[PDB]
Paper text:
Substrate selection occurs in the cytoplasm and inner membrane, mediated by the export gate subcomplex (EscRSTUV in EPEC, and FliPQR, FlhB, FlhA in flagella) and the cytoplasmic ATPase complex (ATPase EscN, peripheral stalk EscL, and central stalk EscO; flagellar FliI, FliH and FliJ, respectively). The ATPase has been proposed to specifically enhance PMF-induced secretion efficiency, as well as to play a role in effector targeting, release from chaperones and unfolding prior to secretion.
The EscN-EscO complex was subjected to single-particle cryo-EM, with 3D classification resulting in two primary classes that refined to high resolution. The EscN model remained similar when refined into the class 2 map (Cα root-mean-square deviation (RMSD) of ~0.5 Å over 2130 residues), with unfilled density from two associated anti-parallel helices attributed to EscO. EscN creates a cradle of negative charge provided predominantly by clustered Glu401 from chains NA through NE (conserved in injectisome orthologues and structurally conserved with the F1 β-subunit DELSEED motif), situated on the apex of the pore-proximal loop.
Residue numbers in the entry:
A (entry chain D): 34 to 446
B (entry chain C), C (entry chain E): 35 to 446
D (entry chain F): 35 to 322, 330 to 446
The structure:
Amino acid sequence: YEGKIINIGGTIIKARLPKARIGAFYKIEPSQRLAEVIAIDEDEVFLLPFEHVSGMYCGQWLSYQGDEFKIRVGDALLGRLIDGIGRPMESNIVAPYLPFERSLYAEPPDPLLRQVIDQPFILGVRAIDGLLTCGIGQRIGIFAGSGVGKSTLLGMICNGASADIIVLALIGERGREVNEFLALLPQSTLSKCVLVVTTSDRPALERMKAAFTATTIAEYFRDQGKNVLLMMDSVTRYARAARDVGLASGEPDVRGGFPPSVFSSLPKLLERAGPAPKGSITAIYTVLLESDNVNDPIGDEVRSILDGHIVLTRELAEENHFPAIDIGLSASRVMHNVVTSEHLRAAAECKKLIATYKNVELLIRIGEYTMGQDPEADKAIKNRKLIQNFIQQSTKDISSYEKTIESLFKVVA
Amino acid sequence: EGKIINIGGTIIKARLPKARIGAFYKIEPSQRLAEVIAIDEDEVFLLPFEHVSGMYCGQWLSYQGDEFKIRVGDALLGRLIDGIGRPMESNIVAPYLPFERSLYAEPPDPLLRQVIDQPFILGVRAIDGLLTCGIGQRIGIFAGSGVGKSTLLGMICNGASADIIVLALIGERGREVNEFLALLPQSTLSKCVLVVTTSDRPALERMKAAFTATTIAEYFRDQGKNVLLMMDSVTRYARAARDVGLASGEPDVRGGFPPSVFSSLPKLLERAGPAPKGSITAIYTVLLESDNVNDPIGDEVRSILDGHIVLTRELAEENHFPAIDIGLSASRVMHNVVTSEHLRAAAECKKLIATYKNVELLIRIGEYTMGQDPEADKAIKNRKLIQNFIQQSTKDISSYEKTIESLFKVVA
Amino acid sequence: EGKIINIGGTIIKARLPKARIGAFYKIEPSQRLAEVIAIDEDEVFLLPFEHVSGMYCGQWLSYQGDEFKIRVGDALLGRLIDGIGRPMESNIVAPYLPFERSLYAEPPDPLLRQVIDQPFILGVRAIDGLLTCGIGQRIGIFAGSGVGKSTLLGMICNGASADIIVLALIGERGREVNEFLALLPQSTLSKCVLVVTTSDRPALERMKAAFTATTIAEYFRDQGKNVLLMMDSVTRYARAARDVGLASGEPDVRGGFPPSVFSSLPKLLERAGPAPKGSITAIYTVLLESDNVNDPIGDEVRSILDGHIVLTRELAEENHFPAIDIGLSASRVMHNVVTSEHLRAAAECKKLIATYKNVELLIRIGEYTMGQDPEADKAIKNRKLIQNFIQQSTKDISSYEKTIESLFKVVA
Amino acid sequence: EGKIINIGGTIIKARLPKARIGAFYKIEPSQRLAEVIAIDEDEVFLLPFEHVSGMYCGQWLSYQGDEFKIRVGDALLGRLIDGIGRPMESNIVAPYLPFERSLYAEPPDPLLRQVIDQPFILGVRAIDGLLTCGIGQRIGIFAGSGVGKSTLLGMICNGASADIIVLALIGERGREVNEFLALLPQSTLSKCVLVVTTSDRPALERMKAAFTATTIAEYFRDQGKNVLLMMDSVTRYARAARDVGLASGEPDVRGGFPPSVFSSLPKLLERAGPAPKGSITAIYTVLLPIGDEVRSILDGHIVLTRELAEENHFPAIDIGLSASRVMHNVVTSEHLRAAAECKKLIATYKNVELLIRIGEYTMGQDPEADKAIKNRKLIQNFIQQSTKDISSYEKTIESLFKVVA
Ligand SMILES: Nc1ncnc2c1ncn2[C@@H]1O[C@H](COP(=O)(O)OP(=O)(O)O)[C@@H](O)[C@H]1O
Ligand SMILES: Nc1ncnc2c1ncn2[C@@H]1O[C@H](COP(=O)(O)OP(=O)(O)O)[C@@H](O)[C@H]1O
Ligand SMILES: Nc1ncnc2c1ncn2[C@@H]1O[C@H](COP(=O)(O)OP(=O)(O)O)[C@@H](O)[C@H]1O
Ligand SMILES: [Mg+2]
Ligand SMILES: [Mg+2]
Ligand SMILES: [Mg+2]
């Protein structure tokens, strides 16, 4: 009715319709599918459809629907599954009464009202609680390569941690995993859990906006005054989808593909989850790397945005050392605030012993290390299988925070 | 309908007013086809089905059909199919197929997948004892060229047991078609559908042949059966999609590949798994652009599939066949499949292999004197048992009980 | 005075005939400002101050200013300012800033700069005992991600003795503005100006916060007092200017960066320093792309800046904090400042650290007979005194006399 | 004389007919100027020196020239000069300058370069006792950061037997020009004519500073005077001409440098040699990619090292790996062989100090290292002195000949 699609191909369509506000979404008039305006030219507009692009033609019409795409949240979406658009997954249900329409692109809190975080957040993994330590309110990434440890460790965290609300986004991952995550969490956890599931099958728009849907639901349950744990599996799938859309919209390449829109819109997503006046969002994001190099474009940028990074390495997964986290290469930017100095000194000595043995281990496997001459290296070896039975852990085993730090004191000295 | 104005060599472009994208057109005098891949307000980009030589400007295009749907039915069992769905063996009568299916369908709904917990016996002791497969798991075989990908699919054709075996041979040798028919017995070839396009064919017919194999496997899944899909070199699909997408004017995001091969590979690989009725267990051969596993296609297909078996060239040079590197390999579904005792025995055998790989260069140089480590002497002592457990000949298959009891005898 | 013709991601384009550069316009339906960054002879490139929410074609523009100016004055202390210039705390009453200044001034005359002779007491034992800073020196702190740039500015800013501190937090997490105010006591918060912009803010606030901080520092310099300016990740300025200029029709040159970044960064980064009345002393945190050596924006900042502290994460992996690599870092302005015996003690224990970094191998390998290398014998005996002099705690600040006394007893 | 088409950040495009590459044009309302890098059939890509803000569509460009030449005369001795040529300060008034010459002059071909004679005394006693240098010889100094090369340059300006001394502080920092001029006397400044430019200044005039200083030194070469040229940090000329080159548009070849700097640096360095009018002793400093290309292109490298400068042994030069290639054509055979035997008397100490760090080395048969141990301190106070310690040429000769005893 308003315009005509005049260019079909790739991820974006292009239309001819004047006076289009940017970000408004338009329905394809005979064929019930709709598309969001991402950019405008002097008369022609770039649109990104919500579904696949097959079956279209030149001069196909476009109707006007709304100024902004908004999702509809409420308190009646706990224990239920949502896609990236906002509509529910399951159809054996009656769909709930969600009363509050919320926009999808909001603001972070005032930087003066973001308090300092000084309470520990316990995950149940002995390594990430003893050596590193999370805090109630921070956001922390799990940086690994392909098929190393990210999902499993995130399942161990979901099984071990406990918040008032749990919002779990599975964006751009395999569809076989939505029943594994539903199997490894109990009904006492499922009663406070919202899944936002976008499979890797889906278009670029759903796989790009599922992260914002999960962040919007998490901040809705934050504004009621509760501590909500957000867990977002592969924020890099958002980064890939935004790369595809931004390159199809005609933007350059900076730092290995990845237009400036990606590095501009990652902080608009990641700054929305932290401490707040009412409640706080503790966030745990997993990051896939383009090799096992930690110095990726997206790996380095999301490492410079987040408040803690947990680096998992493949050469500790070749050795059946699970969870495969590299202690020397991973850090936790809030553990000097959330815990006493005695735990801090013990964790520092355990990190120093791990790095000392890794500095020595090469000249043990070629038979040149001589015992008794270096006092720091010897104590790095005499405790080696005493520190490692602390640092590696089974999947179905959760630990308490007390015997964790008691094992740490027993392991270091 | 319209006329052709450019011919480049991979894609052509034409003056077609208001063509549906995806609809296939016909070159009018010369009996060839093409399909629409992009539209530019009066000028469509077309990908021809056959070779491009002979065309001229202003050559006409006739219309037929809104999409290229293949013709499928129950009478495909025991016969060979072209990549776009023709019967290849022309010495026999054409089969009667009642149904039409388009090549691009949807995966099953994610809440209807029912996490897999039954084993799938392959016959190779290394992907039965140490790695284990599931009914519904899609597996990858990652190697360099010449390392043994096709030998191992030949080993697991005559050892595995499904209802319908759907074997795609896309992008591979024409000489292979008969050698894969020399491994299949008559009780197995009477239930096998073999979709083969070779490396000579145009880029479309190597692109749209994995989708043909998946559509035939989905038709045989939806009847209530168990399908064993196996593709040979899915990276040949990835390279056909690469040079078509780069001819179509698209940027180069990673290692030479457009983003339209990274967005179109999950909507191929995710259609092969568990289902509300039936199942497809799929095995994909993946060739790596060097011996490095961090090839972009190797990395992306490792991040999509449910288990990877990396074969190295060091073990192919050391005459360790099959050349499965155990530390680099994994199987996601094994902890739901095997018992706790079998999982413990598998983990301890893998730790023995890693311990010997630690002490190997130290004993090769000559520093290892017997007696310091308790695990290194265990590795040296069980070395020969582990080696003749992992190493297996081509004409040998094991049953699952003999595999697990030999695992228990080897591990301790 | 013109219509907007297209909206990009970061950029606006309009038809403003004979418009100047720097002339900022506001959008008539929507109250928000935008300044001109390029001309294309009828068609200008503007950069907006905010996001692009509803931006229809043909939206009008109205002339507001020929250049953008900020309100400065002496009644700015103890406050928080954003990159634009307006106060960021809203519960407080708005102050009275008397004067206005443009953000683009020129560095002082190089024949009228003073001579740096007296030290700037910094607080950390390594950058006082080994790399001493003078009053008027521009040093930079070079590291990768999360290696400890912001923690070292916390240690400096805690134990700083300057008459007025301007702290620029450019393009970093909103969380840490309260963590910097948690280690500013009231005696140094009553005379500090925080120019803070967060990483989610639009492109030119993140591009102009450095100019706002240097403008405020030059104002309080021209009053006549010495002032400490500390920028946190001027690399965020550099890649904000990269994303602005590179999307305005300007070519990649060395890292994705246009030539305009390399034209506008040595003018910003040099208008600090000594002066005929007053002196800005500046500490620039620099983020590096990789941990490599061929960084197109780290190398030339290293070249045009007199003194640099290099933090390497290979010392942050053995938990050696602060991770200062004393061999890779230098201070061109310390031989003019400290006494000669201070130079001898600093050079001697740098020599001891450099000796023990490779005598350490032939201690572990059992090849070191005592006495054959006496200097190494002096670098093994005093290893512990050095490694308590170098790394210190975050809350462990120390005065200058204790640092030089402990330096002398470490070297002796 | 031409309207400005558009502004591309650092590139101006104009609509003006018939201009040559390198012609510099004039922004008339603001008094700024900008030179031509490329022409189209009627439009012209040129690039500004200064900042580009304040410019609009339709500003005029006054012609005022066709190539840039510097107004150079005899009265520039003792004045501060920009890389373009205008003075630095406004307290002094610009004197009479009759002549002007362009910045380009072709060097003679290398097949017929002259013989070197006539020892040229620099003032540091270490090299003119050990690594001497003639009049027309051009010398490269390879020093580091924090090695004390600025005092070395100030003390080879102070005590040189040259009537004119020309130095180009090309790309220096803000403080470092006063840091350098604080250690030059007034008797030296009344002999100097010196070009300064800072990293504030645009890369275009930061690369034309080298040609300006070379051109002024060629002017004082033609008046029958022995003249010394100094160019401090040739590498900063290299990065400035790099920024001009790939700012105009050119892909790089080696390191990050375009081949334009590899065509311009032998052209800039191959000139300024032994002319029959009384010639021009060039001293060019390079810090430690193109140091290979510089070290293979001029005769004589002097190496200053941090491993020697960590002690109090100034000037921080090591004779064991630096040598000026022309000494037999300069100094006599007695002085040459005595200097070379003192060089190998120093070089055998470092192969025997490490063997007397351990307790093994004795006397009895080693006639070259037993002499270094006794006659060490005369060596080690011959090859070092302070900043304002001058040692004339007719003292270092007999001092070196009583060092060899
Ligand atoms: N902590 C662990 N313990 C045992 N096995 C693990 C562990 N982490 C990963 N694995 C194995 O490695 C494979 C990859 O795990 P997963 O976390 O799914 O990888 P990704 O991080 O790519 O999702 C799985 O199939 C699993 O069997
Ligand atoms: N398990 C095995 N037993 C014996 N020979 C093998 C085995 N695997 C590979 N080979 C040898 O290595 C070569 C590569 O096998 P093939 O499967 O054809 O490579 P590709 O995986 O590239 O198709 C073959 O020629 C074969 O002889
Ligand atoms: N001086 C120090 N002492 C102890 N830990 C430190 C020190 N500096 C940095 N760290 C650790 O390293 C990490 C990086 O700190 P930070 O200063 O935020 O790095 P950056 O600001 O450069 O990203 C922190 O999580 C912190 O725990
Ligand atoms: Mg996963
Ligand atoms: Mg094969
Ligand atoms: Mg920081």
